[PDB]
């Protein structure tokens, strides 16, 4: 029964979910001036030259596109991270406006919508296991803001039609997720969580500097989903992001001088 409504939204969700009031909860404001360079952080991999994708569901909170996680083929490894982490799903969060939308916020700014990359450490054997784990999991986060077309988010957009509502799911085979990402990997790193229920404390966030630019035509189709199921009175899937948390102790680790 969580959601984002004003009687089922992130103010509520302690009630169900008493971490969300913990000490590594996500997303965060990032304050670029605090975060240090950390020299200590090697080089980060992402390597999915080999991602097959399977298919796109709503959800009821997004849309997930789905990986064959069942073999190391699109993985992330490197940087703030200790082994093999297999990449599962990505999905976004977005606004009803393009000034916001995004969870992590820099310097206050909110960003018209996020990518969340998700992955899971292979030392757990499957996603399940991992995500009860401290280091269970990685996620990739890449602002979006509204400019020119992303040409590798399209195909995405132009299936969001088949999937309107609630439970509905479509083939979504031979899509390639480094359409997604932008030139630069300069990143952000701190241990978090979870930014919906159950909010599991498993996560090393990995969040990148630049942003992708995404039309505004892209985005508006990602508003015309569904909260609700078919038949149901409609609801519009936007502003399907938690607000930024306390970071609390914590500190965020920067890639690059
Ligand atoms: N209505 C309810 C509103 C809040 C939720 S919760 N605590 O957000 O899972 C559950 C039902
Ligand atoms: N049993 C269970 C149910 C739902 C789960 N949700 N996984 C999610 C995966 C990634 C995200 S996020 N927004 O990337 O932090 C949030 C939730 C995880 C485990
Ligand atoms: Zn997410």
């Known amino acids: 029964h969580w959601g984002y409504g004003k009687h089922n939204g992130p103010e509520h969700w302690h009630k169900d979910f008493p971490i969300a009031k913990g000490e ?15 020299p200590s952080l090697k ?37 703030p991270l200790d082994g093999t982490y ?28 996020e990518l ?17 784990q401290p280091d269970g999991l990685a996620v990739l986060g890449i602002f979006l803001k509204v400019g020119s077309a992303k040409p590798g988010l399209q195909k995405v957009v132009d299936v969001l ?21 932008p030139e630069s990997l300069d990143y952000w790193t701190y241990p978090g969580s979870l930014t919906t229920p159950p909010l599991l404390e498993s996560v090393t966030w ?27 009175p409609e609801e519009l899937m936007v502003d399907n992001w938690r607000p930024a948390q306390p970071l609390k102790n914590r500190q965020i680790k920067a890639s690059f001088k």
């Not at 569901?57 to 699109?74: C, I, M, P, T």
């Not at 969340?116 to 009860?132: E, I, M, P, R, S």
């Not at 509905?168 to 997720?177: E, G, M, R």
């Not at 990995?206 to 078919?230: A, T, W, Y």
């Open 161 to 181: 039609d088949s999937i309107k509502t609630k439970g509905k799911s479509a083939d979504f085979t031979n899509f390639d997720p480094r359409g997604l990402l």
């Open 43 to 79: 080089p980060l991999s992402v390597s999915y030259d080999q991602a097959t994708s399977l298919r796109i569901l709503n959800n009821g909170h997004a849309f997930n596109v789905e990986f064959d996680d069942s073999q190391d083929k699109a993985v992330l490894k490197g940087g």
């Open 86 to 113: 297999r990449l599962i799903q990505f999905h976004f969060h977005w606004g009803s406006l393009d000034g916001q939308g995004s969870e992590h916020t820099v310097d206050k700014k909110k960003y018209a919508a």
């Open 24 to 38: 590594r909860q996500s997303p965060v404001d990032i304050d670029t001036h605090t975060a240090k360079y950390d």
């Open 116 to 132: 969340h990359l998700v992955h899971w450490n292979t030392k757990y054997g499957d996603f399940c296991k991992a995500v009860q």
């Open 206 to 232: 990995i969040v990148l500097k630049e942003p992708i630019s995404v039309s505004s035509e892209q985005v508006l189709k990602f508003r015309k989903l569904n909260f609700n199921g078919e038949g149901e």
